Protein backbone atom coordinates (compact mmCIF):
# COMPACT_ATOMS: atom_id res chain seq x y z
CA UNK A 1 0.00 0.00 0.00
CA UNK A 2 1.21 3.60 -0.55
CA UNK A 3 0.38 5.45 2.66
CA UNK A 4 0.69 8.60 2.12
CA UNK A 5 0.36 11.43 5.02
CA UNK A 6 -1.67 14.94 4.99
CA UNK A 7 0.88 17.10 7.05
CA UNK A 8 -0.20 15.24 10.61
CA UNK A 9 -1.40 11.90 10.01
CA UNK A 10 -1.57 9.27 7.17
CA UNK A 11 -4.67 9.10 4.66
CA UNK A 12 -6.41 6.04 3.07
CA UNK A 13 -5.38 5.24 -0.67
CA UNK A 14 -8.12 3.42 -3.20
CA UNK A 15 -6.65 0.99 -5.48
CA UNK A 16 -2.69 -0.51 -4.80
CA UNK A 17 0.38 0.70 -4.89
CA UNK A 18 2.09 -0.35 -8.67
CA UNK A 19 5.69 -1.20 -9.46
CA UNK A 20 8.27 -1.22 -12.05
CA UNK A 21 7.79 -3.50 -14.40
CA UNK A 22 4.23 -4.22 -13.77
CA UNK A 23 1.30 -3.81 -16.65
CA UNK A 24 -0.03 -0.67 -16.19
CA UNK A 25 -4.05 -1.08 -15.31
CA UNK A 26 -4.91 0.60 -18.59
CA UNK A 27 -7.98 2.80 -18.36
CA UNK A 28 -9.37 6.16 -19.73
CA UNK A 29 -9.39 9.65 -18.06
CA UNK A 30 -10.72 12.99 -20.23
CA UNK A 31 -8.20 15.00 -22.21
CA UNK A 32 -8.24 18.73 -21.05
CA UNK A 33 -10.49 18.91 -24.67
CA UNK A 34 -13.51 17.09 -23.08
CA UNK A 35 -12.68 13.75 -25.16
CA UNK A 36 -11.41 10.12 -23.62
CA UNK A 37 -7.77 9.28 -23.93
CA UNK A 38 -6.23 6.15 -22.28
CA UNK A 39 -3.29 4.11 -21.10
CA UNK A 40 -3.32 2.45 -24.57
CA UNK A 41 -3.16 5.90 -26.69
CA UNK A 42 -0.43 6.65 -24.26
CA UNK A 43 1.72 3.55 -25.29
CA UNK A 44 2.30 5.58 -28.66
CA UNK A 45 5.56 6.97 -27.03
CA UNK A 46 7.61 6.52 -23.83
CA UNK A 47 4.99 8.58 -21.30
CA UNK A 48 5.65 10.05 -18.35
CA UNK A 49 2.32 10.86 -16.28
CA UNK A 50 2.26 13.80 -13.47
CA UNK A 51 -0.25 13.28 -10.77
CA UNK A 52 -1.58 16.52 -9.02
CA UNK A 53 -4.59 16.99 -6.93
CA UNK A 54 -5.87 20.46 -8.24
CA UNK A 55 -4.08 22.40 -10.57
CA UNK A 56 -4.55 25.86 -9.66
CA UNK A 57 -1.85 25.30 -6.11
CA UNK A 58 1.26 26.98 -7.29
CA UNK A 59 2.82 23.56 -6.20
CA UNK A 60 1.47 21.97 -9.48
CA UNK A 61 4.00 24.37 -11.67
CA UNK A 62 6.80 22.98 -10.46
CA UNK A 63 5.50 19.65 -12.12
CA UNK A 64 3.61 20.77 -15.19
CA UNK A 65 6.05 23.67 -16.66
CA UNK A 66 9.15 22.49 -15.59
CA UNK A 67 7.98 18.68 -17.22
CA UNK A 68 7.22 21.29 -20.23
CA UNK A 69 11.06 22.49 -20.68
CA UNK A 70 12.51 19.06 -19.75
CA UNK A 71 10.63 17.54 -22.26
CA UNK A 72 11.57 20.02 -24.62
CA UNK A 73 15.15 19.37 -23.48
CA UNK A 74 14.69 15.78 -24.10
CA UNK A 75 13.48 16.07 -27.86
CA UNK A 76 11.79 13.14 -27.96
CA UNK A 77 9.18 12.10 -25.02
CA UNK A 78 5.85 12.24 -24.34
CA UNK A 79 4.05 13.99 -21.03
CA UNK A 80 0.70 13.98 -19.42
CA UNK A 81 -0.36 15.55 -16.45
CA UNK A 82 -3.76 14.27 -14.32
CA UNK A 83 -5.72 16.13 -12.17
CA UNK A 84 -9.38 15.67 -9.89
CA UNK A 85 -9.83 18.98 -11.19
CA UNK A 86 -11.99 20.45 -14.52
CA UNK A 87 -10.51 19.69 -17.67
CA UNK A 88 -10.78 23.66 -18.75
CA UNK A 89 -9.07 24.59 -15.44
CA UNK A 90 -6.12 22.81 -16.77
CA UNK A 91 -6.59 23.74 -20.37
CA UNK A 92 -6.11 27.01 -19.13
CA UNK A 93 -3.53 26.88 -17.25
CA UNK A 94 -1.34 25.20 -20.08
CA UNK A 95 -2.77 28.09 -22.27
CA UNK A 96 -1.82 30.32 -19.44
CA UNK A 97 1.72 28.96 -19.60
CA UNK A 98 2.48 28.61 -23.21
CA UNK A 99 2.97 24.70 -22.56
CA UNK A 100 3.51 22.51 -25.49
CA UNK A 101 5.46 19.13 -24.55
CA UNK A 102 2.94 18.44 -22.13
CA UNK A 103 -0.95 18.16 -22.16
CA UNK A 104 -3.08 17.82 -19.33
CA UNK A 105 -5.87 15.68 -18.53
CA UNK A 106 -9.00 15.02 -15.86
CA UNK A 107 -9.42 11.83 -13.68
CA UNK A 108 -11.81 14.21 -12.30
CA UNK A 109 -14.68 11.97 -13.35
CA UNK A 110 -15.11 8.14 -12.89
CA UNK A 111 -11.34 8.39 -11.10
CA UNK A 112 -10.52 5.38 -12.76
CA UNK A 113 -6.69 6.51 -12.93
CA UNK A 114 -6.70 7.70 -9.53
CA UNK A 115 -8.36 4.73 -8.34
CA UNK A 116 -6.17 1.72 -10.49
CA UNK A 117 -2.86 3.42 -9.72
CA UNK A 118 -3.76 3.58 -6.33
CA UNK A 119 -3.33 7.78 -6.09
CA UNK A 120 -6.89 8.28 -5.22
CA UNK A 121 -6.55 9.32 -1.69
CA UNK A 122 -9.86 7.62 -0.22
CA UNK A 123 -9.94 9.96 2.98
CA UNK A 124 -10.23 13.16 0.96
CA UNK A 125 -11.05 12.49 -2.51
CA UNK A 126 -8.52 13.90 -3.95
CA UNK A 127 -5.54 12.84 -5.78
CA UNK A 128 -1.90 12.44 -4.98
CA UNK A 129 0.75 13.81 -6.13
CA UNK A 130 2.80 11.08 -7.87
CA UNK A 131 4.32 10.28 -11.00
CA UNK A 132 4.85 7.41 -13.17
CA UNK A 133 6.92 6.64 -16.52
CA UNK A 134 5.75 3.93 -19.00
CA UNK A 135 7.27 2.57 -21.89
CA UNK A 136 5.47 1.55 -24.66
CA UNK A 137 4.07 -1.74 -23.98
CA UNK A 138 2.57 0.35 -21.43
CA UNK A 139 4.91 -1.25 -18.57
CA UNK A 140 5.42 1.15 -15.71
CA UNK A 141 9.09 1.96 -15.69
CA UNK A 142 8.93 4.15 -12.72
CA UNK A 143 6.57 4.82 -10.12
CA UNK A 144 6.51 7.31 -7.35
CA UNK A 145 4.36 7.95 -4.53
CA UNK A 146 4.97 11.29 -2.89
CA UNK A 147 4.71 10.31 1.06
CA UNK A 148 2.95 13.34 2.02
CA UNK A 149 0.20 14.54 0.34
CA UNK A 150 1.17 18.46 1.13
CA UNK A 151 4.48 17.89 -1.34
CA UNK A 152 5.56 17.04 -4.77
CA UNK A 153 7.44 14.72 -6.36
CA UNK A 154 10.95 16.04 -8.11
CA UNK A 155 10.26 15.66 -11.82
CA UNK A 156 13.84 15.13 -12.98
CA UNK A 157 13.35 11.75 -11.14
CA UNK A 158 10.85 10.51 -14.48
CA UNK A 159 12.85 12.41 -16.97
CA UNK A 160 15.79 10.40 -15.86
CA UNK A 161 13.52 6.90 -16.31
CA UNK A 162 12.75 8.15 -19.71
CA UNK A 163 15.56 9.38 -20.96
CA UNK A 164 17.21 6.17 -20.51
CA UNK A 165 15.01 4.59 -23.05
CA UNK A 166 14.07 7.26 -25.76
CA UNK A 167 17.84 6.72 -26.48
Same mark, same amino acid.
Given at each position: MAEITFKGGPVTLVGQEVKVGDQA? !??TVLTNSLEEKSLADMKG? @? *?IISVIPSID *? /? @?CDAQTRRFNEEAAKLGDVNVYTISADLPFAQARWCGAN /?? !? =?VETLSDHRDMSFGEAFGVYIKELRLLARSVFVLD?? /? =? @?VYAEYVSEATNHPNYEKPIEAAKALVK
Open positions: P !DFK @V *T *T /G @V /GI !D =KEN /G =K @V
